[PDB]
């Protein structure tokens, strides 16, 4: 029962299953 992805901050999933729509890299999340 993992939530707010421990890699980004715009999803509630896990790294392997993570894809943050912020930039063209991996986790360009501006808040974190
Ligand atoms: Zn994520």
Q: How would you describe the overall organization of this protein?
A:
A zinc finger (CCHC-type) spans 3-20. Nucleocapsid protein. It is found in: Virion. The chain contains no helices and no strands. The termini are far apart. 0% of the residues lie in helices and 0% in strands. The radius of gyration is 9 Å and the shape is globular. The chain has one domain (1-32). The chain is low in regular secondary structure. The structure holds zinc ion (ZN). The site of zinc ion has 7 residues, from loops. Zinc ion (ZN) binds at residues 5, 7-8, 11, 13, 18, 20.
Compact description:
This protein has 32 residues and is largely without helices or strands.
Q: Share of helix among residues? A: under 10%
Terminus-to-terminus distance: 21 Å
C-alpha-based Rg, rounded: 9 Å
Structural class by sheet pairing and helices = little secondary structure
Number of helices, counting only DSSP H or I runs of 4 residues or more = 0
Named once each, the bound ligands are:
zinc ion
Shape assignment: globular
As an assembly, this protein is monomer
Characterize the largest beta sheet: strand count, sense, and whether it forms a barrel: none
**Domains, number:** 1
| Total beta-strand segments | 0
Strand content: under 5%
Protein name: Nucleocapsid protein p14
Function: Nucleocapsid protein.
Subcellular location: Virion
């Amino acid at each position: 029962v993992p939530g707010l992805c421990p890699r980004c901050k715009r999803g509630k999933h896990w790294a392997n299953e993570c894809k943050s729509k912020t930039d063209n890299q991996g986790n360009p999340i501006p808040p974190h």
